[PDB]
Design a protein around this ligand. Sequence first.
Ligand SMILES: Cc1cc2nc3c(=O)[nH]c(=O)nc-3n(C[C@H](O)[C@H](O)[C@H](O)COP(=O)(O)OP(=O)(O)OC[C@H]3O[C@@H](n4cnc5c(N)ncnc54)[C@H](O)[C@@H]3O)c2cc1C
Ligand SMILES: Cc1cc2nc3c(=O)[nH]c(=O)nc-3n(C[C@H](O)[C@H](O)[C@H](O)COP(=O)(O)OP(=O)(O)OC[C@H]3O[C@@H](n4cnc5c(N)ncnc54)[C@H](O)[C@@H]3O)c2cc1C
Ligand SMILES: Cc1cc2nc3c(=O)[nH]c(=O)nc-3n(C[C@H](O)[C@H](O)[C@H](O)COP(=O)(O)OP(=O)(O)OC[C@H]3O[C@@H](n4cnc5c(N)ncnc54)[C@H](O)[C@@H]3O)c2cc1C
Ligand SMILES: Cc1cc2nc3c(=O)[nH]c(=O)nc-3n(C[C@H](O)[C@H](O)[C@H](O)COP(=O)(O)OP(=O)(O)OC[C@H]3O[C@@H](n4cnc5c(N)ncnc54)[C@H](O)[C@@H]3O)c2cc1C
Lengths: 203, 211, 210, 214
Amino acid sequence: HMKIDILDKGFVELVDVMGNDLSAVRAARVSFERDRHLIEYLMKHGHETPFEHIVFTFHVKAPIFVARQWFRHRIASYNELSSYEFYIPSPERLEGYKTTIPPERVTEKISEIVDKAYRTYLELIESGVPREVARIVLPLNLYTRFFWTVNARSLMNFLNLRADSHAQWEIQQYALAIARIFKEKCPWTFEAFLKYAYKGDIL
Amino acid sequence: MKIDILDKGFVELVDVMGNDLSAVRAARVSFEERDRHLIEYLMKHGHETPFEHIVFTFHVKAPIFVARQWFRHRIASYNELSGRYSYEFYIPSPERLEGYKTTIPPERVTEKISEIVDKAYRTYLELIESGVPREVARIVLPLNLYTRFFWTVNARSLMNFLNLRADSHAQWEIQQYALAIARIFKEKCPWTFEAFLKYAYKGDILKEVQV
Amino acid sequence: MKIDILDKGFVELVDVMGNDLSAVRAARVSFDEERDRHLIEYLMKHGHETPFEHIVFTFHVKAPIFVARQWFRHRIASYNELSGRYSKLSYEFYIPSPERLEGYKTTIPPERVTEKISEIVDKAYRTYLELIESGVPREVARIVLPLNLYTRFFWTVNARSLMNFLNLRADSHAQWEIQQYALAIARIFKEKCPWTFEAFLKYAYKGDIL
Amino acid sequence: MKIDILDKGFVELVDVMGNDLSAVRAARVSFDDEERDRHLIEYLMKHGHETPFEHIVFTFHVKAPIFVARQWFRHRIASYNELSGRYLSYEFYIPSPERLEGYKTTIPPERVTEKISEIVDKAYRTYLELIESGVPREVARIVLPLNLYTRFFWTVNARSLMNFLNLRADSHAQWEIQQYALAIARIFKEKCPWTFEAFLKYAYKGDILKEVQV
Ligand SMILES: Cc1cc2nc3c(=O)[nH]c(=O)nc-3n(C[C@H](O)[C@H](O)[C@H](O)COP(=O)(O)OP(=O)(O)OC[C@H]3O[C@@H](n4cnc5c(N)ncnc54)[C@H](O)[C@@H]3O)c2cc1C
Ligand SMILES: Cc1cc2nc3c(=O)[nH]c(=O)nc-3n(C[C@H](O)[C@H](O)[C@H](O)COP(=O)(O)OP(=O)(O)OC[C@H]3O[C@@H](n4cnc5c(N)ncnc54)[C@H](O)[C@@H]3O)c2cc1C
Ligand SMILES: Cc1cc2nc3c(=O)[nH]c(=O)nc-3n(C[C@H](O)[C@H](O)[C@H](O)COP(=O)(O)OP(=O)(O)OC[C@H]3O[C@@H](n4cnc5c(N)ncnc54)[C@H](O)[C@@H]3O)c2cc1C
Ligand SMILES: Cc1cc2nc3c(=O)[nH]c(=O)nc-3n(C[C@H](O)[C@H](O)[C@H](O)COP(=O)(O)OP(=O)(O)OC[C@H]3O[C@@H](n4cnc5c(N)ncnc54)[C@H](O)[C@@H]3O)c2cc1C
């Protein structure tokens, strides 16, 4: 039932979990500590199929540009909603970058066009324009929500790619919440993953 | 839940994530008779994705010729006993040969299958007793040798499996496994199952064979 | 073989592996024209579609992001979208034509709806350049751009998955924009695999517009 | 392009879509410089950006013993079409003495060969008998040994193919499938030389392909 807030209005919420570290042990042996030893053994040599028997269901609220990257992970199940909020980058988001415009003003200019686009959308809607058409004016930082069911193996591949300094900061934050939850429900698998398979650097 | 299939096989439910409501939750993307109304609506309109949020893990013991057919379903996860490092055989019953006129009595056919299986197995043990590695010695064992595997699959894929295996076109032996699979599916997801039969099931036996 | 879609989009055939006979060869597992078409119709009629997985296409698509998001929901395929790390990035947007709004009674004339969409696109785009020039990283600045921004991708999919794509997108219930791309996809598919395409429409196509 | 494997098997190239440049065009998303293209292939492989290689596809026709096919069919990201056993041509894999020539046995390597050959013969005969008798082939075939040869068409993209080689072109895999993987590698090397060399240099996890040639 975990829920972690991300960005200004987003979140990653655990909906359900099937199995735990032992589910992988049971699959590896096809049965029902030497177990903690098996998990590391499987992880080191790359015998990842057993980890497919651990599944998670997440409910995610994220901006569309983050969701688009996320949806690139094909080995998972998705259900997106089909209620108007936008991700406004905080000023600290620009730290490290020397901008002509003070960080606060960048955050302002972003709020402004967002507000203008949204008002235009509302206007078109109020005039009878089909929502599917009017919505194309909305910006990429609009929040959407979706359910994500993914097994532990696919999830680790997701973390290898998004829990990395080379990934956009925003997606990293989401990947951090995903890892946090994965760690809570599968300590052994996660630790093992971190010790032998994790390719990123932020975890 | 363990259901015996054939002479020594079985389908045993290991774990399950969610139920009919999981698909309802997924469909609405949030947290009585209207939920069941939703399941039906999704099924009759081809909105299958919500059902991917229901997942099962089965433990199956079946003859290799049946497993081979089963493993053809790629949208699932499998873990089977290693033929290399990890001995019962399926002997059809005389009744299995009912309907086909044979030159010899059904029990004769049954006896003969039992005969070769016995010879193959005896030869196998002989090879092993001789120092022959199992990965090599096992190649003489027949296709009716029983094997075991864990199968994790979501409800949408499980329904595709039923469309194909719980049908008269599939070999009788796997139909039997498909019936047990359907039996378990129905008990864990009654609304989805009824909706499935009513609007999307393409097979024939599940609409004739109770549960 | 290229087809223009919307105002600045397109679907272009990049490569294709096999033809109708590739599904025949796979079905028979090996290696008379009417005997071959009969097998193809036979496979399609009984839902034996795996043989059609041995026909593959690679398309180059230029579409608005909102169309792309729906398209990318088809997981049994391969995609590579433009990033800017290997190729230059261009900025164009889908501006609906007044006709797109027919059948709908609007308080604002169609031409005025088109005008308003162009307006936001212009302002969103300029705010974007404003941010870039100010030293704001593109990854951050681009978040103000609208969903009608055109993007490009390569799409490799086999004929079976392709037919699933047409069943869902070449249909009146799918958004009009994606329908236009689906029609174009169907067309190239027909040109390269007429027997398979014919059979698809006769026994398996679930949609309506084709 | 056909290569014999084991005593009666083979791997045959049926078709192929694209080449090394298919990955380059996909990574650049452009459908319009050997030095630079080769550099990009290596860059992609070195940094794990593997999706571009999914736009290179192969179709093979394979003949292998069922015990080998069962291992092969475990690779799910691919397309398979196998001969229907439920609905001619029965051959079996008989290990040569050199196969066991490395393990201490209590009988001559040649005896194992004869032993295996015997049962295969006995099982095959019983099967033919049952068939003649009127027993459906889907039922009579269950007495056939796992070394029976089957055939299938295999369509797989370059990315998935490399995962297959990682796992099967390795000393940890059974010797028999190792032989097939070597043949697969040979064909792969011939059609996509750059991707293959890049594969071996930055991503290949097995042993044999860096030891054996082509
Ligand atoms: C009566 C009967 C006779 C049969 N005869 C033969 C035979 O002669 N030869 C033979 O080889 N097999 C035969 N089969 C096996 C048949 O090919 C299987 O149904 C198939 O291998 C597994 O089914 P699937 O594709 O529906 O399932 P899955 O592999 O689980 O896939 C589920 C869904 O995902 C899809 N999908 C998955 N991967 C891909 C992909 N790579 N490309 C496109 N779509 C994909 C499709 O939409 C599919 O319906 C037979 C089966 C039956 C029941
Ligand atoms: C009018 C309309 C409304 C829509 N509304 C919504 C909405 O509210 N929410 C939403 O999320 N989407 C919505 N969609 C998108 C729709 O769900 C897409 O068609 C779908 O996400 C992509 O199709 P697919 O699963 O058939 O294809 P693919 O992902 O390419 O899969 C092909 C086949 O393989 C299968 N398959 C693949 N992966 C799996 C898996 N992991 N488990 C089980 N089976 C699998 C199935 O048999 C499938 O048909 C809508 C589309 C339309 C036209
Ligand atoms: C810094 C960075 C830059 C990026 N740049 C680009 C870019 O320029 N263009 C772009 O398009 N994307 C880009 N991406 C997104 C990247 O391509 C995604 O990681 C990918 O689309 C989804 O990952 P996946 O294939 O590993 O995962 P999934 O799709 O979930 O697949 C999991 C595993 O299954 C596999 N697999 C699944 N389907 C197939 C298939 N059909 N064929 C073969 N193997 C398969 C592989 O073994 C894979 O690792 C970038 C990402 C990052 C972090
Ligand atoms: C030496 C050796 C020993 C073996 N021992 C055993 C054993 O004891 N027991 C046994 O059962 N098998 C065993 N196998 C078979 C092994 O499980 C296979 O490698 C596997 O079934 C097929 O590999 P794959 O997952 O890498 O490939 P594919 O199925 O082709 O998948 C390709 C890539 O896509 C992925 N992927 C595809 N589908 C999913 C999914 N549903 N969820 C998550 N990720 C997915 C991963 O990123 C994957 O690497 C062994 C193999 C070898 C070589």
